[PDB]
PDB file of all heavy atoms in Angstrom:
ATOM      1  N   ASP A   2     -99.124  32.988-111.127  1.00  0.00           N
ATOM      2  CA  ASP A   2    -100.057  33.318-110.060  1.00  0.00           C
ATOM      3  C   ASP A   2    -101.040  32.179-110.068  1.00  0.00           C
ATOM      4  O   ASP A   2    -101.137  31.468-111.074  1.00  0.00           O
ATOM      5  CB  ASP A   2    -100.799  34.631-110.315  1.00  0.00           C
ATOM      6  CG  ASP A   2    -100.097  35.851-109.780  1.00  0.00           C
ATOM      7  OD1 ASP A   2     -99.397  35.781-108.753  1.00  0.00           O
ATOM      8  OD2 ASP A   2    -100.221  36.901-110.439  1.00  0.00           O
ATOM      9  N   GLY A   3    -101.755  31.964-108.979  1.00  0.00           N
ATOM     10  CA  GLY A   3    -102.865  31.077-109.185  1.00  0.00           C
ATOM     11  C   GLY A   3    -103.781  31.890-110.060  1.00  0.00           C
ATOM     12  O   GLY A   3    -104.400  32.853-109.597  1.00  0.00           O
ATOM     13  N   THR A   4    -103.891  31.502-111.323  1.00  0.00           N
ATOM     14  CA  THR A   4    -104.646  32.282-112.287  1.00  0.00           C
ATOM     15  C   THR A   4    -104.867  31.387-113.495  1.00  0.00           C
ATOM     16  O   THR A   4    -104.170  30.389-113.674  1.00  0.00           O
ATOM     17  CB  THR A   4    -103.904  33.579-112.640  1.00  0.00           C
ATOM     18  OG1 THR A   4    -103.575  34.275-111.437  1.00  0.00           O
ATOM     19  CG2 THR A   4    -104.773  34.510-113.427  1.00  0.00           C
ATOM     20  N   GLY A   5    -105.850  31.734-114.313  1.00  0.00           N
ATOM     21  CA  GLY A   5    -105.978  31.062-115.588  1.00  0.00           C
ATOM     22  C   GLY A   5    -105.299  31.892-116.647  1.00  0.00           C
ATOM     23  O   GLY A   5    -104.935  31.405-117.720  1.00  0.00           O
ATOM     24  N   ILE A   6    -105.123  33.168-116.324  1.00  0.00           N
ATOM     25  CA  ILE A   6    -104.559  34.127-117.258  1.00  0.00           C
ATOM     26  C   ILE A   6    -103.054  33.984-117.344  1.00  0.00           C
ATOM     27  O   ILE A   6    -102.489  33.948-118.440  1.00  0.00           O
ATOM     28  CB  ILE A   6    -104.963  35.544-116.836  1.00  0.00           C
ATOM     29  CG1 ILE A   6    -106.453  35.757-117.055  1.00  0.00           C
ATOM     30  CG2 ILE A   6    -104.143  36.545-117.564  1.00  0.00           C
ATOM     31  CD1 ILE A   6    -106.962  37.006-116.436  1.00  0.00           C
ATOM     32  N   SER A   7    -102.381  33.911-116.199  1.00  0.00           N
ATOM     33  CA  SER A   7    -100.926  33.856-116.203  1.00  0.00           C
ATOM     34  C   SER A   7    -100.431  32.601-116.896  1.00  0.00           C
ATOM     35  O   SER A   7     -99.437  32.643-117.625  1.00  0.00           O
ATOM     36  CB  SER A   7    -100.397  33.906-114.778  1.00  0.00           C
ATOM     37  OG  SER A   7    -100.777  32.733-114.089  1.00  0.00           O
ATOM     38  N   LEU A   8    -101.095  31.471-116.665  1.00  0.00           N
ATOM     39  CA  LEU A   8    -100.792  30.275-117.440  1.00  0.00           C
ATOM     40  C   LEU A   8    -100.941  30.546-118.923  1.00  0.00           C
ATOM     41  O   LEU A   8    -100.033  30.277-119.708  1.00  0.00           O
ATOM     42  CB  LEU A   8    -101.697  29.119-117.025  1.00  0.00           C
ATOM     43  CG  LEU A   8    -101.475  28.336-115.735  1.00  0.00           C
ATOM     44  CD1 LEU A   8    -101.179  29.199-114.523  1.00  0.00           C
ATOM     45  CD2 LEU A   8    -102.673  27.443-115.483  1.00  0.00           C
ATOM     46  N   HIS A   9    -102.079  31.101-119.321  1.00  0.00           N
ATOM     47  CA  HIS A   9    -102.337  31.309-120.737  1.00  0.00           C
ATOM     48  C   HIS A   9    -101.301  32.227-121.366  1.00  0.00           C
ATOM     49  O   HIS A   9    -100.870  31.996-122.499  1.00  0.00           O
ATOM     50  CB  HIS A   9    -103.735  31.874-120.934  1.00  0.00           C
ATOM     51  CG  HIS A   9    -104.115  32.011-122.369  1.00  0.00           C
ATOM     52  ND1 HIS A   9    -103.743  33.092-123.135  1.00  0.00           N
ATOM     53  CD2 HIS A   9    -104.797  31.182-123.191  1.00  0.00           C
ATOM     54  CE1 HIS A   9    -104.199  32.934-124.361  1.00  0.00           C
ATOM     55  NE2 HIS A   9    -104.841  31.785-124.422  1.00  0.00           N
ATOM     56  N   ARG A  10    -100.892  33.274-120.654  1.00  0.00           N
ATOM     57  CA  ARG A  10     -99.817  34.112-121.164  1.00  0.00           C
ATOM     58  C   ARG A  10     -98.533  33.320-121.307  1.00  0.00           C
ATOM     59  O   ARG A  10     -97.805  33.476-122.289  1.00  0.00           O
ATOM     60  CB  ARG A  10     -99.597  35.303-120.249  1.00  0.00           C
ATOM     61  CG  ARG A  10    -100.744  36.251-120.201  1.00  0.00           C
ATOM     62  CD  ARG A  10    -100.426  37.337-119.227  1.00  0.00           C
ATOM     63  NE  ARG A  10     -99.296  38.123-119.676  1.00  0.00           N
ATOM     64  CZ  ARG A  10     -98.675  39.008-118.915  1.00  0.00           C
ATOM     65  NH1 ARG A  10     -99.068  39.191-117.672  1.00  0.00           N
ATOM     66  NH2 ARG A  10     -97.655  39.696-119.388  1.00  0.00           N
ATOM     67  N   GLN A  11     -98.232  32.466-120.333  1.00  0.00           N
ATOM     68  CA  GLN A  11     -97.074  31.599-120.477  1.00  0.00           C
ATOM     69  C   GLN A  11     -97.230  30.661-121.659  1.00  0.00           C
ATOM     70  O   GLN A  11     -96.236  30.307-122.295  1.00  0.00           O
ATOM     71  CB  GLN A  11     -96.843  30.799-119.204  1.00  0.00           C
ATOM     72  CG  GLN A  11     -95.593  29.964-119.254  1.00  0.00           C
ATOM     73  CD  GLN A  11     -95.321  29.285-117.951  1.00  0.00           C
ATOM     74  OE1 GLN A  11     -96.036  29.491-116.978  1.00  0.00           O
ATOM     75  NE2 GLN A  11     -94.280  28.471-117.914  1.00  0.00           N
ATOM     76  N   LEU A  12     -98.457  30.238-121.965  1.00  0.00           N
ATOM     77  CA  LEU A  12     -98.668  29.497-123.200  1.00  0.00           C
ATOM     78  C   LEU A  12     -98.226  30.317-124.400  1.00  0.00           C
ATOM     79  O   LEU A  12     -97.407  29.852-125.195  1.00  0.00           O
ATOM     80  CB  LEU A  12    -100.128  29.073-123.342  1.00  0.00           C
ATOM     81  CG  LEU A  12    -100.568  27.726-122.763  1.00  0.00           C
ATOM     82  CD1 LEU A  12     -99.681  26.632-123.315  1.00  0.00           C
ATOM     83  CD2 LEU A  12    -100.548  27.694-121.250  1.00  0.00           C
ATOM     84  N   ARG A  13     -98.720  31.551-124.525  1.00  0.00           N
ATOM     85  CA  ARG A  13     -98.239  32.439-125.579  1.00  0.00           C
ATOM     86  C   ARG A  13     -96.724  32.537-125.570  1.00  0.00           C
ATOM     87  O   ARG A  13     -96.100  32.737-126.614  1.00  0.00           O
ATOM     88  CB  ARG A  13     -98.820  33.840-125.422  1.00  0.00           C
ATOM     89  CG  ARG A  13    -100.293  33.946-125.567  1.00  0.00           C
ATOM     90  CD  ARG A  13    -100.733  35.380-125.511  1.00  0.00           C
ATOM     91  NE  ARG A  13    -102.181  35.494-125.535  1.00  0.00           N
ATOM     92  CZ  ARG A  13    -102.835  36.631-125.361  1.00  0.00           C
ATOM     93  NH1 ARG A  13    -102.170  37.752-125.154  1.00  0.00           N
ATOM     94  NH2 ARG A  13    -104.152  36.650-125.395  1.00  0.00           N
ATOM     95  N   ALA A  14     -96.111  32.389-124.399  1.00  0.00           N
ATOM     96  CA  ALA A  14     -94.670  32.556-124.298  1.00  0.00           C
ATOM     97  C   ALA A  14     -93.952  31.393-124.958  1.00  0.00           C
ATOM     98  O   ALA A  14     -93.199  31.577-125.917  1.00  0.00           O
ATOM     99  CB  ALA A  14     -94.265  32.682-122.832  1.00  0.00           C
ATOM    100  N   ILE A  15     -94.167  30.184-124.437  1.00  0.00           N
ATOM    101  CA  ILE A  15     -93.671  28.972-125.071  1.00  0.00           C
ATOM    102  C   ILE A  15     -93.999  28.968-126.553  1.00  0.00           C
ATOM    103  O   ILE A  15     -93.179  28.569-127.382  1.00  0.00           O
ATOM    104  CB  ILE A  15     -94.265  27.752-124.360  1.00  0.00           C
ATOM    105  CG1 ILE A  15     -93.781  27.718-122.921  1.00  0.00           C
ATOM    106  CG2 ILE A  15     -93.906  26.482-125.095  1.00  0.00           C
ATOM    107  CD1 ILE A  15     -94.510  26.717-122.066  1.00  0.00           C
ATOM    108  N   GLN A  16     -95.193  29.431-126.914  1.00  0.00           N
ATOM    109  CA  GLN A  16     -95.640  29.315-128.294  1.00  0.00           C
ATOM    110  C   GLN A  16     -94.872  30.241-129.220  1.00  0.00           C
ATOM    111  O   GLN A  16     -94.332  29.790-130.233  1.00  0.00           O
ATOM    112  CB  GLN A  16     -97.132  29.584-128.375  1.00  0.00           C
ATOM    113  CG  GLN A  16     -97.968  28.435-127.884  1.00  0.00           C
ATOM    114  CD  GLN A  16     -99.435  28.798-127.816  1.00  0.00           C
ATOM    115  OE1 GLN A  16     -99.782  29.977-127.825  1.00  0.00           O
ATOM    116  NE2 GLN A  16    -100.299  27.794-127.681  1.00  0.00           N
ATOM    117  N   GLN A  17     -94.810  31.531-128.907  1.00  0.00           N
ATOM    118  CA  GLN A  17     -94.114  32.453-129.793  1.00  0.00           C
ATOM    119  C   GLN A  17     -92.638  32.103-129.908  1.00  0.00           C
ATOM    120  O   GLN A  17     -92.042  32.254-130.975  1.00  0.00           O
ATOM    121  CB  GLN A  17     -94.282  33.877-129.292  1.00  0.00           C
ATOM    122  CG  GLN A  17     -93.693  34.911-130.203  1.00  0.00           C
ATOM    123  CD  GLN A  17     -94.400  34.989-131.521  1.00  0.00           C
ATOM    124  OE1 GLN A  17     -95.598  35.229-131.579  1.00  0.00           O
ATOM    125  NE2 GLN A  17     -93.665  34.793-132.592  1.00  0.00           N
ATOM    126  N   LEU A  18     -92.031  31.637-128.820  1.00  0.00           N
ATOM    127  CA  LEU A  18     -90.639  31.208-128.880  1.00  0.00           C
ATOM    128  C   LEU A  18     -90.452  30.080-129.881  1.00  0.00           C
ATOM    129  O   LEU A  18     -89.488  30.081-130.650  1.00  0.00           O
ATOM    130  CB  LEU A  18     -90.166  30.768-127.500  1.00  0.00           C
ATOM    131  CG  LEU A  18     -88.698  30.395-127.292  1.00  0.00           C
ATOM    132  CD1 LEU A  18     -87.786  31.207-128.173  1.00  0.00           C
ATOM    133  CD2 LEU A  18     -88.334  30.612-125.850  1.00  0.00           C
ATOM    134  N   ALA A  19     -91.357  29.103-129.884  1.00  0.00           N
ATOM    135  CA  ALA A  19     -91.222  27.993-130.813  1.00  0.00           C
ATOM    136  C   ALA A  19     -91.321  28.457-132.256  1.00  0.00           C
ATOM    137  O   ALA A  19     -90.645  27.908-133.127  1.00  0.00           O
ATOM    138  CB  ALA A  19     -92.276  26.936-130.525  1.00  0.00           C
ATOM    139  N   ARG A  20     -92.150  29.462-132.531  1.00  0.00           N
ATOM    140  CA  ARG A  20     -92.212  30.004-133.882  1.00  0.00           C
ATOM    141  C   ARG A  20     -90.888  30.627-134.287  1.00  0.00           C
ATOM    142  O   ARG A  20     -90.426  30.425-135.411  1.00  0.00           O
ATOM    143  CB  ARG A  20     -93.325  31.040-133.996  1.00  0.00           C
ATOM    144  CG  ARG A  20     -94.723  30.495-133.895  1.00  0.00           C
ATOM    145  CD  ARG A  20     -95.709  31.622-134.056  1.00  0.00           C
ATOM    146  NE  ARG A  20     -97.095  31.183-133.986  1.00  0.00           N
ATOM    147  CZ  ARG A  20     -97.778  31.058-132.855  1.00  0.00           C
ATOM    148  NH1 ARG A  20     -97.209  31.334-131.695  1.00  0.00           N
ATOM    149  NH2 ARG A  20     -99.038  30.651-132.884  1.00  0.00           N
ATOM    150  N   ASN A  21     -90.269  31.401-133.392  1.00  0.00           N
ATOM    151  CA  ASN A  21     -89.012  32.059-133.731  1.00  0.00           C
ATOM    152  C   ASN A  21     -87.919  31.048-134.021  1.00  0.00           C
ATOM    153  O   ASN A  21     -87.123  31.235-134.943  1.00  0.00           O
ATOM    154  CB  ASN A  21     -88.574  32.983-132.603  1.00  0.00           C
ATOM    155  CG  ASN A  21     -89.517  34.123-132.394  1.00  0.00           C
ATOM    156  OD1 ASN A  21     -89.915  34.418-131.274  1.00  0.00           O
ATOM    157  ND2 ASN A  21     -89.877  34.784-133.470  1.00  0.00           N
ATOM    158  N   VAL A  22     -87.859  29.972-133.243  1.00  0.00           N
ATOM    159  CA  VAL A  22     -86.799  28.994-133.435  1.00  0.00           C
ATOM    160  C   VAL A  22     -86.978  28.257-134.753  1.00  0.00           C
ATOM    161  O   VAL A  22     -86.021  28.080-135.510  1.00  0.00           O
ATOM    162  CB  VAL A  22     -86.752  28.031-132.241  1.00  0.00           C
ATOM    163  CG1 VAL A  22     -85.777  26.927-132.505  1.00  0.00           C
ATOM    164  CG2 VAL A  22     -86.369  28.783-131.002  1.00  0.00           C
ATOM    165  N   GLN A  23     -88.205  27.829-135.058  1.00  0.00           N
ATOM    166  CA  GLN A  23     -88.477  27.213-136.353  1.00  0.00           C
ATOM    167  C   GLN A  23     -88.036  28.104-137.496  1.00  0.00           C
ATOM    168  O   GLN A  23     -87.606  27.606-138.542  1.00  0.00           O
ATOM    169  CB  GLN A  23     -89.967  26.923-136.501  1.00  0.00           C
ATOM    170  CG  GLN A  23     -90.507  25.911-135.534  1.00  0.00           C
ATOM    171  CD  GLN A  23     -89.869  24.560-135.697  1.00  0.00           C
ATOM    172  OE1 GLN A  23     -89.595  24.123-136.815  1.00  0.00           O
ATOM    173  NE2 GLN A  23     -89.633  23.880-134.583  1.00  0.00           N
ATOM    174  N   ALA A  24     -88.137  29.416-137.323  1.00  0.00           N
ATOM    175  CA  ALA A  24     -87.776  30.332-138.390  1.00  0.00           C
ATOM    176  C   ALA A  24     -86.268  30.439-138.547  1.00  0.00           C
ATOM    177  O   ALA A  24     -85.748  30.334-139.659  1.00  0.00           O
ATOM    178  CB  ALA A  24     -88.380  31.704-138.125  1.00  0.00           C
ATOM    179  N   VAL A  25     -85.545  30.645-137.447  1.00  0.00           N
ATOM    180  CA  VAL A  25     -84.112  30.877-137.567  1.00  0.00           C
ATOM    181  C   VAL A  25     -83.381  29.600-137.937  1.00  0.00           C
ATOM    182  O   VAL A  25     -82.360  29.645-138.627  1.00  0.00           O
ATOM    183  CB  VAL A  25     -83.553  31.493-136.279  1.00  0.00           C
ATOM    184  CG1 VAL A  25     -84.153  32.850-136.066  1.00  0.00           C
ATOM    185  CG2 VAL A  25     -83.844  30.602-135.107  1.00  0.00           C
ATOM    186  N   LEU A  26     -83.875  28.447-137.502  1.00  0.00           N
ATOM    187  CA  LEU A  26     -83.266  27.205-137.951  1.00  0.00           C
ATOM    188  C   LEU A  26     -83.512  26.978-139.431  1.00  0.00           C
ATOM    189  O   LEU A  26     -82.724  26.303-140.092  1.00  0.00           O
ATOM    190  CB  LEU A  26     -83.789  26.031-137.136  1.00  0.00           C
ATOM    191  CG  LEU A  26     -83.382  26.049-135.670  1.00  0.00           C
ATOM    192  CD1 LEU A  26     -84.033  24.898-134.944  1.00  0.00           C
ATOM    193  CD2 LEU A  26     -81.884  25.973-135.549  1.00  0.00           C
ATOM    194  N   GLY A  27     -84.598  27.527-139.967  1.00  0.00           N
ATOM    195  CA  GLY A  27     -84.812  27.463-141.395  1.00  0.00           C
ATOM    196  C   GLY A  27     -84.071  28.522-142.170  1.00  0.00           C
ATOM    197  O   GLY A  27     -83.985  28.429-143.396  1.00  0.00           O
ATOM    198  N   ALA A  28     -83.545  29.534-141.483  1.00  0.00           N
ATOM    199  CA  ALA A  28     -82.725  30.532-142.148  1.00  0.00           C
ATOM    200  C   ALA A  28     -81.437  29.909-142.655  1.00  0.00           C
ATOM    201  O   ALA A  28     -81.081  30.055-143.827  1.00  0.00           O
ATOM    202  CB  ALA A  28     -82.430  31.679-141.190  1.00  0.00           C
ATOM    203  N   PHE A  29     -80.732  29.190-141.786  1.00  0.00           N
ATOM    204  CA  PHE A  29     -79.537  28.477-142.207  1.00  0.00           C
ATOM    205  C   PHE A  29     -79.836  27.410-143.241  1.00  0.00           C
ATOM    206  O   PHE A  29     -78.912  26.896-143.872  1.00  0.00           O
ATOM    207  CB  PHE A  29     -78.862  27.867-140.991  1.00  0.00           C
ATOM    208  CG  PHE A  29     -78.366  28.886-140.021  1.00  0.00           C
ATOM    209  CD1 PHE A  29     -79.164  29.307-138.985  1.00  0.00           C
ATOM    210  CD2 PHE A  29     -77.119  29.454-140.169  1.00  0.00           C
ATOM    211  CE1 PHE A  29     -78.722  30.251-138.106  1.00  0.00           C
ATOM    212  CE2 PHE A  29     -76.675  30.394-139.292  1.00  0.00           C
ATOM    213  CZ  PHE A  29     -77.478  30.796-138.259  1.00  0.00           C
ATOM    214  N   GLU A  30     -81.102  27.043-143.411  1.00  0.00           N
ATOM    215  CA  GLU A  30     -81.513  26.246-144.558  1.00  0.00           C
ATOM    216  C   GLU A  30     -81.668  27.112-145.805  1.00  0.00           C
ATOM    217  O   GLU A  30     -81.177  26.756-146.876  1.00  0.00           O
ATOM    218  CB  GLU A  30     -82.817  25.532-144.224  1.00  0.00           C
ATOM    219  N   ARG A  31     -82.344  28.254-145.679  1.00  0.00           N
ATOM    220  CA  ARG A  31     -82.447  29.195-146.787  1.00  0.00           C
ATOM    221  C   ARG A  31     -81.084  29.772-147.135  1.00  0.00           C
ATOM    222  O   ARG A  31     -80.733  29.906-148.309  1.00  0.00           O
ATOM    223  CB  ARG A  31     -83.388  30.328-146.412  1.00  0.00           C
ATOM    224  CG  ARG A  31     -84.778  29.930-146.010  1.00  0.00           C
ATOM    225  CD  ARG A  31     -85.509  29.448-147.187  1.00  0.00           C
ATOM    226  NE  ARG A  31     -86.900  29.111-146.926  1.00  0.00           N
ATOM    227  CZ  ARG A  31     -87.908  29.956-147.067  1.00  0.00           C
ATOM    228  NH1 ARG A  31     -87.688  31.190-147.469  1.00  0.00           N
ATOM    229  NH2 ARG A  31     -89.141  29.554-146.822  1.00  0.00           N
ATOM    230  N   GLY A  32     -80.312  30.144-146.113  1.00  0.00           N
ATOM    231  CA  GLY A  32     -79.099  30.903-146.335  1.00  0.00           C
ATOM    232  C   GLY A  32     -77.962  30.085-146.902  1.00  0.00           C
ATOM    233  O   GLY A  32     -77.098  30.624-147.592  1.00  0.00           O
ATOM    234  N   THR A  33     -77.942  28.783-146.626  1.00  0.00           N
ATOM    235  CA  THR A  33     -76.923  27.941-147.233  1.00  0.00           C
ATOM    236  C   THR A  33     -77.091  27.870-148.739  1.00  0.00           C
ATOM    237  O   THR A  33     -76.108  27.703-149.462  1.00  0.00           O
ATOM    238  CB  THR A  33     -76.953  26.542-146.628  1.00  0.00           C
ATOM    239  OG1 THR A  33     -75.879  25.772-147.165  1.00  0.00           O
ATOM    240  CG2 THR A  33     -78.234  25.846-146.948  1.00  0.00           C
ATOM    241  N   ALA A  34     -78.319  28.000-149.232  1.00  0.00           N
ATOM    242  CA  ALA A  34     -78.543  28.041-150.668  1.00  0.00           C
ATOM    243  C   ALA A  34     -78.250  29.418-151.234  1.00  0.00           C
ATOM    244  O   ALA A  34     -77.602  29.539-152.274  1.00  0.00           O
ATOM    245  CB  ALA A  34     -79.975  27.634-150.992  1.00  0.00           C
ATOM    246  N   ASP A  35     -78.707  30.467-150.557  1.00  0.00           N
ATOM    247  CA  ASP A  35     -78.425  31.821-151.014  1.00  0.00           C
ATOM    248  C   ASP A  35     -76.936  32.098-151.030  1.00  0.00           C
ATOM    249  O   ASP A  35     -76.435  32.787-151.922  1.00  0.00           O
ATOM    250  CB  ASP A  35     -79.129  32.828-150.118  1.00  0.00           C
ATOM    251  CG  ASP A  35     -78.825  34.244-150.502  1.00  0.00           C
ATOM    252  OD1 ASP A  35     -79.225  34.653-151.604  1.00  0.00           O
ATOM    253  OD2 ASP A  35     -78.188  34.954-149.701  1.00  0.00           O
ATOM    254  N   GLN A  36     -76.213  31.582-150.047  1.00  0.00           N
ATOM    255  CA  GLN A  36     -74.771  31.774-150.033  1.00  0.00           C
ATOM    256  C   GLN A  36     -74.099  30.955-151.114  1.00  0.00           C
ATOM    257  O   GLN A  36     -73.076  31.373-151.659  1.00  0.00           O
ATOM    258  CB  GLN A  36     -74.210  31.386-148.680  1.00  0.00           C
ATOM    259  CG  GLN A  36     -72.774  31.756-148.487  1.00  0.00           C
ATOM    260  CD  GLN A  36     -72.299  31.378-147.128  1.00  0.00           C
ATOM    261  OE1 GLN A  36     -73.069  30.895-146.312  1.00  0.00           O
ATOM    262  NE2 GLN A  36     -71.033  31.582-146.869  1.00  0.00           N
ATOM    263  N   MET A  37     -74.647  29.783-151.423  1.00  0.00           N
ATOM    264  CA  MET A  37     -74.085  28.964-152.486  1.00  0.00           C
ATOM    265  C   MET A  37     -74.110  29.694-153.812  1.00  0.00           C
ATOM    266  O   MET A  37     -73.188  29.558-154.618  1.00  0.00           O
ATOM    267  CB  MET A  37     -74.848  27.654-152.600  1.00  0.00           C
ATOM    268  CG  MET A  37     -74.295  26.693-153.614  1.00  0.00           C
ATOM    269  SD  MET A  37     -72.657  26.241-153.071  1.00  0.00           S
ATOM    270  CE  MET A  37     -73.101  25.591-151.472  1.00  0.00           C
ATOM    271  N   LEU A  38     -75.164  30.460-154.074  1.00  0.00           N
ATOM    272  CA  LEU A  38     -75.193  31.235-155.305  1.00  0.00           C
ATOM    273  C   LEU A  38     -74.024  32.198-155.348  1.00  0.00           C
ATOM    274  O   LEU A  38     -73.171  32.113-156.232  1.00  0.00           O
ATOM    275  CB  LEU A  38     -76.510  31.990-155.451  1.00  0.00           C
ATOM    276  CG  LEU A  38     -77.674  31.290-156.147  1.00  0.00           C
ATOM    277  CD1 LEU A  38     -78.147  30.142-155.343  1.00  0.00           C
ATOM    278  CD2 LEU A  38     -78.806  32.256-156.339  1.00  0.00           C
ATOM    279  N   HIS A  39     -73.935  33.081-154.355  1.00  0.00           N
ATOM    280  CA  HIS A  39     -72.922  34.128-154.358  1.00  0.00           C
ATOM    281  C   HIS A  39     -71.534  33.587-154.645  1.00  0.00           C
ATOM    282  O   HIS A  39     -70.776  34.189-155.405  1.00  0.00           O
ATOM    283  CB  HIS A  39     -72.928  34.860-153.026  1.00  0.00           C
ATOM    284  CG  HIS A  39     -74.175  35.634-152.776  1.00  0.00           C
ATOM    285  ND1 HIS A  39     -75.316  35.059-152.266  1.00  0.00           N
ATOM    286  CD2 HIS A  39     -74.466  36.938-152.976  1.00  0.00           C
ATOM    287  CE1 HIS A  39     -76.255  35.979-152.152  1.00  0.00           C
ATOM    288  NE2 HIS A  39     -75.765  37.127-152.578  1.00  0.00           N
ATOM    289  N   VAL A  40     -71.177  32.451-154.053  1.00  0.00           N
ATOM    290  CA  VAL A  40     -69.852  31.923-154.318  1.00  0.00           C
ATOM    291  C   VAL A  40     -69.757  31.316-155.704  1.00  0.00           C
ATOM    292  O   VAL A  40     -68.653  31.177-156.231  1.00  0.00           O
ATOM    293  CB  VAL A  40     -69.435  30.885-153.268  1.00  0.00           C
ATOM    294  CG1 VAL A  40     -69.506  31.494-151.880  1.00  0.00           C
ATOM    295  CG2 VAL A  40     -70.272  29.666-153.380  1.00  0.00           C
ATOM    296  N   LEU A  41     -70.881  30.955-156.318  1.00  0.00           N
ATOM    297  CA  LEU A  41     -70.847  30.598-157.727  1.00  0.00           C
ATOM    298  C   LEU A  41     -70.764  31.842-158.597  1.00  0.00           C
ATOM    299  O   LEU A  41     -69.956  31.901-159.523  1.00  0.00           O
ATOM    300  CB  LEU A  41     -72.072  29.772-158.104  1.00  0.00           C
ATOM    301  CG  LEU A  41     -72.244  28.386-157.495  1.00  0.00           C
ATOM    302  CD1 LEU A  41     -73.574  27.814-157.912  1.00  0.00           C
ATOM    303  CD2 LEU A  41     -71.142  27.480-157.928  1.00  0.00           C
ATOM    304  N   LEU A  42     -71.590  32.848-158.319  1.00  0.00           N
ATOM    305  CA  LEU A  42     -71.550  34.062-159.123  1.00  0.00           C
ATOM    306  C   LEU A  42     -70.213  34.763-159.005  1.00  0.00           C
ATOM    307  O   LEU A  42     -69.748  35.384-159.963  1.00  0.00           O
ATOM    308  CB  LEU A  42     -72.650  35.040-158.722  1.00  0.00           C
ATOM    309  CG  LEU A  42     -74.143  34.930-158.973  1.00  0.00           C
ATOM    310  CD1 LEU A  42     -74.773  33.776-158.279  1.00  0.00           C
ATOM    311  CD2 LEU A  42     -74.744  36.207-158.447  1.00  0.00           C
ATOM    312  N   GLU A  43     -69.597  34.717-157.827  1.00  0.00           N
ATOM    313  CA  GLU A  43     -68.338  35.421-157.645  1.00  0.00           C
ATOM    314  C   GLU A  43     -67.245  34.843-158.520  1.00  0.00           C
ATOM    315  O   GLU A  43     -66.339  35.569-158.932  1.00  0.00           O
ATOM    316  CB  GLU A  43     -67.910  35.377-156.182  1.00  0.00           C
ATOM    317  N   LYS A  44     -67.291  33.545-158.797  1.00  0.00           N
ATOM    318  CA  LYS A  44     -66.266  32.888-159.597  1.00  0.00           C
ATOM    319  C   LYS A  44     -66.657  32.672-161.050  1.00  0.00           C
ATOM    320  O   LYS A  44     -65.889  32.053-161.786  1.00  0.00           O
ATOM    321  CB  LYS A  44     -65.889  31.550-158.978  1.00  0.00           C
ATOM    322  CG  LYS A  44     -66.971  30.513-159.001  1.00  0.00           C
ATOM    323  CD  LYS A  44     -66.471  29.260-158.330  1.00  0.00           C
ATOM    324  CE  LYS A  44     -67.525  28.199-158.280  1.00  0.00           C
ATOM    325  NZ  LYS A  44     -67.063  27.078-157.438  1.00  0.00           N
TER     326      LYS A  44
END
């Protein structure tokens, strides 16, 4: 809308999305190590 609010909410939008992506891309960083254990412990 012509608004200062709708822009700002869209800021929150772009912003929260970037937090989620940083997290899930770091999961496959965390999880590759956690999975490495299990395949060591299993054998």
Side-chain angles (χ1 to χ4, degrees), residues 2-29 31-42 44:
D2 271 328
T4 307
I6 291 169
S7 66
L8 284 45
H9 185 277
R10 295 178 65 191
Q11 185 175 356
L12 270 306
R13 296 185 185 173
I15 296 169
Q16 284 173 342
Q17 185 66 58
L18 185 33
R20 291 181 179 87
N21 295 132
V22 173
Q23 295 298 322
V25 296
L26 294 176
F29 296 92
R31 303 289 184 92
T33 185
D35 177 66
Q36 189 179 357
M37 184 63 58
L38 271 67
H39 294 83
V40 304
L41 294 175
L42 288 64
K44 67 181 178 189

